[PDB]
Amino acid sequence: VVAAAEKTKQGVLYVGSKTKEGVVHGVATVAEKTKEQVTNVGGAVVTGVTAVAQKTVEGAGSIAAATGFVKK
Amino acid sequence: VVAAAEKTKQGVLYVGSKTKEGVVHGVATVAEKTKEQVTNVGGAVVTGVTAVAQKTVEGAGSIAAATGFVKK
Amino acid sequence: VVAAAEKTKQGVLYVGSKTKEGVVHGVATVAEKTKEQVTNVGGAVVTGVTAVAQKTVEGAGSIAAATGFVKK
Amino acid sequence: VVAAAEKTKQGVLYVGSKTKEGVVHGVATVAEKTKEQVTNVGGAVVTGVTAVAQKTVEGAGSIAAATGFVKK
Amino acid sequence: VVAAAEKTKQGVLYVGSKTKEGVVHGVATVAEKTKEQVTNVGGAVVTGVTAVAQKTVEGAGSIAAATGFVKK
Amino acid sequence: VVAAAEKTKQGVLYVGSKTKEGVVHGVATVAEKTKEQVTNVGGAVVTGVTAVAQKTVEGAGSIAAATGFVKK
Amino acid sequence: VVAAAEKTKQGVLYVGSKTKEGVVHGVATVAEKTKEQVTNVGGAVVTGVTAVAQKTVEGAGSIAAATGFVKK
Amino acid sequence: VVAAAEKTKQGVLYVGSKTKEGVVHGVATVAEKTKEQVTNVGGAVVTGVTAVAQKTVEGAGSIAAATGFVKK
Amino acid sequence: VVAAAEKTKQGVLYVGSKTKEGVVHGVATVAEKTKEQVTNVGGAVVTGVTAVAQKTVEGAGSIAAATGFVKK
Amino acid sequence: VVAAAEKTKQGVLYVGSKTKEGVVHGVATVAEKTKEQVTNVGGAVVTGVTAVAQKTVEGAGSIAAATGFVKK
Amino acid sequence: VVAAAEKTKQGVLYVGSKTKEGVVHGVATVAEKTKEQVTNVGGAVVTGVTAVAQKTVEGAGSIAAATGFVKK
Amino acid sequence: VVAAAEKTKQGVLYVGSKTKEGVVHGVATVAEKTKEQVTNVGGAVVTGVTAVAQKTVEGAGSIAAATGFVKK
């Protein structure tokens, strides 16, 4: 799990939201009469009513994520 | 799982949303009378009513993600 | 889990949200009559009604995250 | 879990939120008649009604996070 | 868990929030008739009604966090 | 858990919040008829109605945090 | 206009309404660029979303109404 | 306009309304650029979302109403 | 305009209303650029969201109303 | 305008209202750039969100009302 | 305008209101740039959020009202 | 304008109101740039949030009201 990024050197961004009674569920784990529940989050969970990402990377940007699940 | 990115050097973006009673579910795991539940998230879960991504990468951008599930 | 980033050198960003009765749930783990519950968070959970990320990376930016689950 | 970042050298950002009765839940772990509950947080949980991140990284920025769960 | 950052050398940021009856829960662990509850926090929990982070890193900034859970 | 940061050398930031009846809970651990409860905090819990962080790092800034939980 | 009523002496009533977005207009007079408008009401205007009249008359009941319009 | 009523002597009433966003207009007079507007009400205008009249008359009841409009 | 009522002698009433965002207008007179406006009310204007009249008359009851409009 | 009422001698009433954001206008006279406005009220204007009239008349009850409008 | 009432001789009343943000206007006269405004009230204006009238008349009750408007 | 009432001889009343942010206007006269404004009140104006009238008349009760408006 190797990530790399390098940058060498030698307008209008409009979002308009007009909602009414907005119900958002990002990650849900619902049950009844269980014995074991695991919610293993290792990435990126973004939840919103107006979820906006503008100009996220303009240079060197790297993300390295790793998640495991071993029960044996 | 290797990711790499390199950049070497030598307008109007409009989103318009007008909703009413918006119900959003990104990732759901619903059950009843279970014994084991796993919600292994290792990537990228984006949930919204107005989910906008403008000009995400304009330089060097890399994402490396790995997820496993071993039970034996 | 190795992340690296290097940068060497030698407008209007508008978000408009007008909501009413917004209910947001980022990560939920609901059950009834369980024996063991684990909520292992090791990434990045962003929750909002107006979740905005503008110009996040403009230099050298790296994120390295690792999460495990061993039960044996 | 190694993160590195180096930077060597030789506009209007508007967010507008006008909500009414906003209920936000970032991370929830609800149960009934359990025996063991673990809420292991090791990343970054951001919760808000107006969650804004503007110009987060403009220099050298690195984040290294690690979380484990061993039960044997 | 090693993080490093180095920087060598040789506008308007507006957030506007106008809410009414905002209820925010960052991290919650609710149960009934339990035997053991652990809330292990080792990252960064940010909770607010107007949670704003402007110009967080403009120099050398590193964060190294580690959290464990061993029960045997 | 090693963090390092070095920096060598040789606008308007507006946040406006106008809320009414804001209820915020950062970290909560609620139960009933338990035997052992642990709230191990070792990172950074920020809670507010108007939680603002402006120009946090402009020099050399490092944070190293470690938290454990061993029960055997 | 003479009304008379005399009375000499010697169960389940269920109404169930379950609507959604009901718009009712009983009596309307809409115009543009007039010289004279008259709304002479002299009877009985009943307007509702659930307009129910149960067991209105069980004794002596009389209604006498007269309405005129003379312009010459 | 004569009304008379005489009475000489010698169960379950259920109304159930469950609406949502109900807009009611009983009597309206809407115009633009007039010279004279008259709203002569002389009867009975009942306006509601749940307009219920149960067991209105069980004895002697009379109503006499008269309304005129002379302009010459 | 004569009304008379005489009475000589010798259960469950349920109304249930559960609305949401109810807008009621009983009598309205809306205009623009007039010379004379008259709102002559001489009867009975009942306006409500839950307008209920139960067991209004059980004895001797009479109502006499007269309304005029002379302009010449 | 003569009203008379004479009476000679020789249960559960339930109203339940559960609303939210109720806006009521009984009698309105809205205009712009007039020369004369008259609001002659001479009857009975009842305005409410929960307007209930239970057992109004059980004896001798009479109402006599007269309203005029002469302009010449 | 003569009213008379004579009476010669020889249960549970429940109203339940549970509202939220109730705005009530009984009698209104709104204008702009007039020459004369008259609000002649001579009857009975009842305005409320919970306007209840229980057992109003159980004996001899009479109401006589007269209202004039002469301009010549 | 003559009113008379004579009476010759030879339970639970519950009102429950639970509101929040109640705004009530009984009689209003709003304008701008006039020459004469008259608010002639001669009847009965009852304004409240919980306006309750229980057992108003149980004996001899009479009300006589007269209101004039002469301008010539």
Q: Name the DSSP class of H2.
A: E
Cα separation of L69 and L72, whole Å?
10
Which of D2, D7, D35 to probe the E interface (max E CBs under 10 A)? D7
Cα separation of E45 and E49, whole Å?
14
Cα angle for residues E22, A16, E58 (degrees, 5° grid): 75
End-to-end Cα, chain J, rounded Å:
23
Sheet holding A2-9, edge to edge: B2-9, A2-9, C2-9, D2-9, E2-9, F2-9
Cα separation of B32 and A34, whole Å?
8
Provide Rg for chain L, Cα atoms.
19
**Resolution reached, in Å?**
2.9
Cα separation of H26 and H37, whole Å?
18
Tokens of F68: 């454990």
Q: Which residue has the tokens 């996040």?
A: C56
Judge: G54–H54 Cβ closer than 8 Å, yes or no.
yes
Distance between D66 CA and the closest CA of chain A, angstroms = 10
Cα separation of F64 and C4, whole Å?
19
Which of A15, A23, A63 to probe the C interface (max C CBs under 10 A)? A63
Q: Of F36, D19, C35, K11, which is closest to residue A37 (Cα–Cα)?
A: C35
The answer to whether the beta carbons of residues C26 and D25 sit under 8 Å apart is: yes
Cα separation of K14 and G18, whole Å?
23
Q: Per the annotation, where are the binding residues of E for Cu cation? A: 25
Q: Where are the beta strands (DSSP E) in K18-72?
A: 23-30, 37-41, 45-47, 50-54, 60-67
Other Cβ atoms less than 10 A from the Cβ of B14: the count is 12
Please state, in angstroms and as integers, the Cα–Cα distance from residue G60 to each residue in F17, I57, K8, following that order: 65, 10, 20
Provide Rg for chain G, Cα atoms.
19
Cα separation of C54 and C60, whole Å?
16
Distance between F9 CA and the closest CA of chain D, angstroms = 10
Helices (H), chain J: none
Judge: F36–E35 Cβ closer than 8 Å, yes or no.
yes
Residue of E nearest to D38 (CA): E38
Residues contacting G41, CB < 8 A, separation 6+: G27, G67, H27, H39, H40, H41, H42, H43, H45, H67, I43
Cα separation of B61 and J65, whole Å?
82
Q: Do chains H and J touch (3 or more CB pairs under 8 A)?
A: yes
- The residues on K that touch I, with CB distances below 8 Å, are 3, 5, 7, 17, 43, 51, 57
Tokens of L45: 């104006």
Sheet holding H23-30, edge to edge: G23-30, H23-30, I23-30, J23-30, K23-30, L23-30
Chain C CB contacts of E41 under 8 Å are none
Tokens of B70: 């071993």
Cα separation of L69 and K39, whole Å?
10
- The residues on J that touch L, with CB distances below 8 Å, are 41-42, 48, 50, 59-61, 64
Please state, in angstroms and as integers, the Cα–Cα distance from residue C60 to each residue in B4, B41, C57, J18, following that order: 14, 27, 7, 57
Chain I CB contacts of J7 under 8 Å are 6-8, 59-60
Cα separation of D38 and E38, whole Å?
5
Q: Let me know if L35 is exposed, middle or buried by CB neighbors in 10 A (0-12, 13-18, 19+).
A: exposed
Distance between I26 CA and the closest CA of chain J, angstroms = 5
Judge: J64–L5 Cβ closer than 8 Å, yes or no.
no
Distance between C20 CA and the closest CA of chain E, angstroms = 9
Cα angle for residues A18, A22, A26 (degrees, 5° grid): 120
Q: Which of D37, D41, D62 sits opposite E3 (nearest CB)?
A: D62
Q: Do chains F and C touch (3 or more CB pairs under 8 A)?
A: no
Please state, in angstroms and as integers, the Cα–Cα distance from residue J40 to each residue in G27, I2, K25, K66, K67, following that order: 21, 23, 17, 11, 8
Residues contacting L40, CB < 8 A, separation 6+: K38, K39, K40, K41, K42, L67, L69
Residues contacting A6, CB < 8 A, separation 6+: A60, B5, B6, B7, B60, C5, C6, C7, C8
Which of B2, B8, B62, B69 to probe the C interface (max C CBs under 10 A)? B62
Backbone angles phi, psi at B31, to 5 degrees: -150, -175
Chain G CB contacts of H55 under 8 Å are 54-55, 58
Cα separation of L17 and K19, whole Å?
8
Which of I8, I18, I19, I32 to probe the G interface (max G CBs under 10 A)? I19
Cα separation of F10 and A16, whole Å?
45
Cα separation of A49 and B22, whole Å?
9
Distance between D59 CA and the closest CA of chain C, angstroms = 5
The answer to whether the beta carbons of residues C2 and A1 sit under 8 Å apart is: yes
Cα separation of K29 and K25, whole Å?
11
Q: Which residue has the tokens 């292991």?
A: D40
Residue of J nearest to L21 (CA): J21
Residue K56's identity, in one-letter code, is: T
The answer to whether the beta carbons of residues A33 and C33 sit under 8 Å apart is: yes
Judge: C59–E5 Cβ closer than 8 Å, yes or no.
no
